[PDB]
A paper describes a structure:
Natural resistance-associated macrophage proteins (Nramps) are APC-superfamily transition metal transporters that enable uptake of rare micronutrients such as Mn2+ in plants and bacteria and Fe2+ in animals. Nramps bind and/or transport biologically-essential divalent metals such as Mn2+, Fe2+, Co2+, Ni2+, Cu2+, Zn2+—and toxic metals like Cd2+, Pb2+, and Hg2+—but not the abundant alkaline earth metals Mg2+ and Ca2+. Metal uptake by Nramps is typically stimulated by acidic pH and accompanied by proton influx. Nramps have 11 or 12 TMs, the first ten forming a LeuT fold, as seen in structures of three bacterial Nramp homologs, including our model system Deinococcus radiodurans (Dra)Nramp.
We chose to pursue G223W—on TM6a one helical turn above the unwound metal-binding region—which like G45R eliminated Co2+ and Fe2+ metal transport. Importantly, a tryptophan modeled in the inward-open DraNramp Patch mutant structure at position 223 clashes with the top of TM10. In contrast, G223W significantly increased A61C accessibility while fully protecting A53C, consistent with an outward-locked state. We also determined a G223W apo structure, which lacks electron density attributable to metal substrate in the binding site but is otherwise similar to the metal-bound state (Cα RMSD = 1.08 Å); hence we used the metal-bound structure for all further analyses. The G223W ΔN34 apo dataset compiled from many small crystals is 96% complete to 4.5 Å, 92% complete to 3.4 Å, 77% complete to 3.0 Å, 66% complete to 2.85 Å, and 52% complete to 2.7 Å. Compared to the inward-open and inward-occluded structures, in the outward-open state TM1b, TM6a, and the top of TM10 are splayed open, and loop 1–2 is displaced by ~4 Å, to form a wide aqueous pathway to the metal-binding site. On the cytoplasmic side, TM4 and TM5 move significantly (by ~8 Å) straddling TM8 and approaching TM1a, while TM1a also approaches TM8 to fully shut the interior aqueous vestibule. Surprisingly, in the presence of a favorable negative membrane potential established using K+ gradients and the K+-ionophore valinomycin, G223W enabled larger basal H+ influx than WT, while G45R had no H+ flux. As the transporter reaches the outward-open state seen in EcoNramp and our apo G223W structure, a protonation event at D56 may prime the binding site to receive another incoming metal ion.
Author numbering: 39 to 436
Write the structure that this text describes.
C-alpha cells in the first residue's frame, strides 16, 4: 500500500552487494582507482531494470518466473531450469558462504572451518524467519543492508576520496587491458539469476488484488521500491570501489583482490576500525545473500517442480561446497572463477524467460511491459549475455 515491495526489492538488492561484489570492487579501486565507477553505475542501472521486470512479472501475472516457466514450457526444459538454477543458487551461495566465513576469521581468527560452521547455523536461522511469513526475513536483510551502507559511508569519509578523481572516474573510458577486463567483469557478473526468480516470487500475490487497475497501481509502487533498493546497492558498490581506490591505488598493494589481504592492508593505511567495519560489512553481506540465496533455491524448485525439500536440508547441501573448499584449501582463483562461470551461465536463462513473459498479454494482461521498454531490456540483456560469453570464453578457453 505505502511501500509494499521494498522488502522484496531489498531482498533482491543484497545479492548485488554480496561478498562477490566486495572482492571485485576492492580490486577495482585498488588497481585502477576510480576509473571504473561508471561501470558500477551502468551495471547497477541495468540490474535495476532487470529486477524491476521480475518484480513486475509477479505483480501483473500473480506467478513467479519459475512458475510461468513450469506451466508454459515443456518439462524437459523446466527440469533443466530447476537444475540450472539450483547450481546457480549453489555456486552463488558458495562465494557468499565463504565470504561470510572469511569475515568471521578476520574478526576472531578462527580457522575457516569453524567460521563456516558459524555461517551455517546462523544462515539457517535466517530462513526460519521464512518458514512463517516472509516480512521477518525482509527486515533481517533490511537491517543487514543498513549495516552494509553505514559501514561503507563511514569508510568513504575515512578514505577521504578525491571527488575530482571520483568524478573523473564517472567519465566512460578505460586505459588498456585489466582495467577493460575488470569493467567487463562488473558488467557481466552483476545480474544475479537466483534473485531474478525470487524477486517475482516475493511480489506474486503479495497484495491481493482482483482488478487490472489496482495492479498497475502496484507496478508504479514497486518501481520506486526497486530503484530505491537497487540504487542503494549501486552506491554501496561505488563506495567499496572508492574506498579501495582511496587507499590502495598507489600503495604497492598487490593481491588486493582477496579480502583477507585488503582487511590487513587497511589497518596500517586507514586504521583498525576501517578493517573491522569492512569485515562486519563483509560478514553481514555474506550472511544475508547466503540466506536469500537459500530462499531463492527454495522458490526455484517449488516453482519449477512443485515439491519442496526442508530448508535445513537445502541449507546443508549448499553448505557442503564451502566446507569442501575449506577442507581442501584452494585459492579463490579456482573458487571465485568456477562459481561465476555458473552465474554467467545462468544469467541468460534468467533474462530470456523474463523479457518474454513480461511481453505477453496472456501473462501480464493490460500490464504488458511497454514495447519501448521491452526493447531496452533486450539490449541490456544482449550486452550482458555477450560479455558473459566473453568471460565464459576467456576462462574455459577457445
Amino acid at each position: 500500500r505505502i511501500l509494499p515491495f521494498l522488502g522484496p526489492a531489498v531482498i533482491a538488492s543484497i545479492a548485488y552487494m554480496d561478498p562477490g561484489n566486495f572482492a571485485t570492487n576492492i580490486e577495482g579501486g585498488a588497481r585502477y582507482g576510480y576509473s571504473l565507477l561508471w561501470v558500477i553505475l551502468a551495471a547497477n542501472l541495468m540490474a535495476m531494470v532487470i529486477q524491476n521486470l521480475s518484480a513486475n512479472l509477479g505483480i501483473a501475472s500473480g506467478r513467479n518466473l519459475p512458475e510461468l516457466i513450469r506451466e508454459r514450457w515443456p518439462r524437459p526444459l523446466v527440469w533443466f531450469y530447476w537444475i540450472q538454477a539450483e547450481l546457480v543458487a549453489m555456486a552463488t551461495d558458495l562465494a557468499e558462504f565463504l565470504g561470510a566465513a572469511l569475515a568471521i576469521q578476520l574478526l576472531t581468527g578462527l580457522p575457516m572451518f569453524w567460521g563456516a560452521v558459524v555461517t551455517g547455523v546462523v544462515t539457517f536461522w535466517l530462513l526460519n524467519l521464512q518458514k512463517r511469513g516472509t516480512r521477518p526475513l525482509e527486515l533481517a536483510v533490511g537491517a543487514f543492508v543498513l549495516m552494509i551502507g553505514v559501514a561503507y559511508l563511514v569508510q568513504v569519509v575515512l578514505a577521504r576520496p578525491d571527488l575530482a578523481a571520483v568524478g573523473a572516474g564517472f567519465v566512460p573510458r578505460l586505459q588498456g587491458p585489466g582495467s577493460a577486463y575488470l569493467a567487463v567483469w562488473i558488467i557481466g557478473a552483476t545480474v544475479m539469476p537466483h534473485v531474478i526468480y525470487l524477486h517475482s516470487a516475493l511480489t506474486q500475490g503479495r497484495i491481493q488484488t482482483d482488478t487490472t487497475e489496482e495492479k498497475r497501481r502496484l507496478v508504479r509502487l514497486n518501481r520506486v521500491d526497486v530503484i530505491a533498493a537497487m540504487g542503494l546497492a549501486g552506491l554501496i558498490n561505488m563506495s567499496m570501489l572508492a574506498v579501495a581506490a582511496a587507499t590502495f591505488h598507489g600503495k604497492n598493494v598487490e593481491n588486493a583482490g582477496d579480502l583477507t589481504t585488503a582487511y590487513q592492508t587497511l589497518t596500517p593505511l586507514l586504521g583498525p576500525a576501517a578493517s573491522v567495519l569492512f569485515a562486519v560489512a563483509l560478514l553481514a553481506s555474506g550472511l544475508s545473500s547466503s540466506a536469500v540465496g537459500t530462499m531463492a533455491g527454495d522458490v526455484i524448485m517449488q516453482g519449477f517442480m512443485g515439491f519442496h525439500i526442508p530448508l535445513w536440508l537445502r541449507r546443508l547441501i549448499t553448505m557442503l561446497p564451502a566446507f569442501i573448499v575449506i577442507l581442501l584449501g584452494m585459492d579463490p582463483s579456482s573458487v571465485l572463477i568456477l562459481s561465476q562461470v555458473i552465474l554467467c551461465f545462468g544469467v541468460p536463462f534468467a533474462l530470456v524467460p523474463l523479457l518474454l513473459f513480461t511481453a505477453r498479454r496472456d501473462v501480464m494482461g493490460a500490464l504488458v511491459t511497454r514495447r519501448s521498454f521491452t526493447v531496452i531490456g533486450w539490449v541490456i540483456a544482449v550486452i550482458i549475455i555477450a560479455l558473459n560469453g566473453y568471460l565464459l570464453w576467456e576462462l574455459l578457453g577457445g
